[PDB]
Amino acid sequence: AFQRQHMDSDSSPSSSSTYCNQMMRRRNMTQGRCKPVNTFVHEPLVDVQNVCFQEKVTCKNGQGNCYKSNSSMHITDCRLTNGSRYPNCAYRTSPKERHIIVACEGSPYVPVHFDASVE
Secondary structure, three states: OHHHHHEOOOOOOOOOOOHHHHHHHHOOOOOOOOOOEEEEEOOOHHHHHHHHHOEEEOOOOOOOOEEEOOOOEEEEEEEEOOOOOOOOOOEEEEEEEEOEEEEEEOOOOEEEEEEEEOO
């Protein structure tokens, strides 16, 4: 689910373009109801995966072993707009450069949950 919900390596959207409107639907987060908030990471998959071997930190939700990126990364926050009511799901697109925190699990040990962005 991490790849589908949070990875979009080849994109670099701008402030409240149609990006989030398009992506939240494309990545299956507007079915049944509009997912309120979500973040996409615009970095190569390999660099995001390497975060699992960087700075270990306490998670911002259930445990699961979280790690903070050594470097800030290019992300985009999607946030449901006020005048948005299902089935019509409208989002504000907010590009940012922040350190990210992910929960890693499995074998291979890779990111499985996006915990939060720093700052």
